[PDB]
Amino acid sequence: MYTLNWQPPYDWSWMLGFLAARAVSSVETVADSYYARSLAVGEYRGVVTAIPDIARHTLHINLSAGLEPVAAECLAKMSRLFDLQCNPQIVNGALGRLGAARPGLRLPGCVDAFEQGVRAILGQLVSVAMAAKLTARVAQLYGERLDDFPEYICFPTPQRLAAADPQALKALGMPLKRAEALIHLANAALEGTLPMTIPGDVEQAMKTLQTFPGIGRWTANYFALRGWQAKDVFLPDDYLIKQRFPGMTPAQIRRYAERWKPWRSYALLHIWYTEGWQPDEA
């Protein structure tokens, strides 16, 4: 129905693979040839489907009837999820050897910053698989199913999560403080306190995020990366990153990563996805 362009190369297998591992049951559906999910924009609800046309470097977007009135915003959300803006030549030119194995690697964003905030908090100290299962439980208990597409449930609205019982969220498999962090984040979205789009000053904004209860440095960094699609953020506290930089403290990792500025977010993804990566010796 709608078509958006991207600049080659684009590694769709890697991107869909990334999203498939993190796919929340009943909310998202990821396959080899497409990505589909429920979506709510204000009072408009439906299913958005993204189908890449690799040869023609065009992403085809299909929207169910309920989302047509807000089609443009749905296209904008897809563009941010898929990093369609990326000029791979510039990024790969800067990263050099690090990006050589996956020149088509892109920054997987999100469809809604509030949802990504909840996801970032739920991704704390747990694996990708556990986080997705926990997020699915949250969506199942607080999400609204689509009337026209019953197999799909919309991600919980800030309103529903703000009024959630901390003990209910805790029951789903998270510490009480984490449940409290989610409720606070929900209120911040209602009030307009949580930046829904990348601010002009990413560092100032992340500092402000860390004053929210239950949001540490990793969550703030990861939220900026996916939630705002900030392109210059690394995750020195990340469990897998600590394994890629054996025996190095978060401070040592941060210093090392500075060589990738202003594309540290792309560098993070490549390291996460480079099995045998190891740091250079001074």
What is the distance of C-alpha 196 from the center of its chain?
13
What's the one-letter identity of residue 58? Answer: T
Residue 187 token pair:
């209120």
Q: 168-204 burial, b if ≥16 CB within 10 A, otherwise e?
A: ebeebebeeebbbbbbbbbbbbeeeebbeebeeebee
Domains assigned to the chain: 1-112 (3.30.310.20), 113-230 (1.10.340.30), 231-282 (1.10.1670.10)
**Residue 69 burial (CB count, 10 A):** 15
With beta carbons less than 8 A apart as the criterion, state whether 67 and 1 touch.
no
Annotated catalytic residue 238: yes
Residue 88, preceding peptide bond in cis (omega within 30° of 0): no
Strands of 25-172 (E only): list them.
28-30, 35-41, 44-53, 58-63
Sign of CA dihedral 71, 75, 80, 81: positive
Residue 56 token pair:
């023609």
Rounded (10°) CA dihedral 125, 128, 134, 136: 160
Structural determination approach = X-ray
Q: One of 83, 112, 232, 238 is an active-site residue; which one? A: 238
Resolution attained, angstroms: 1.8
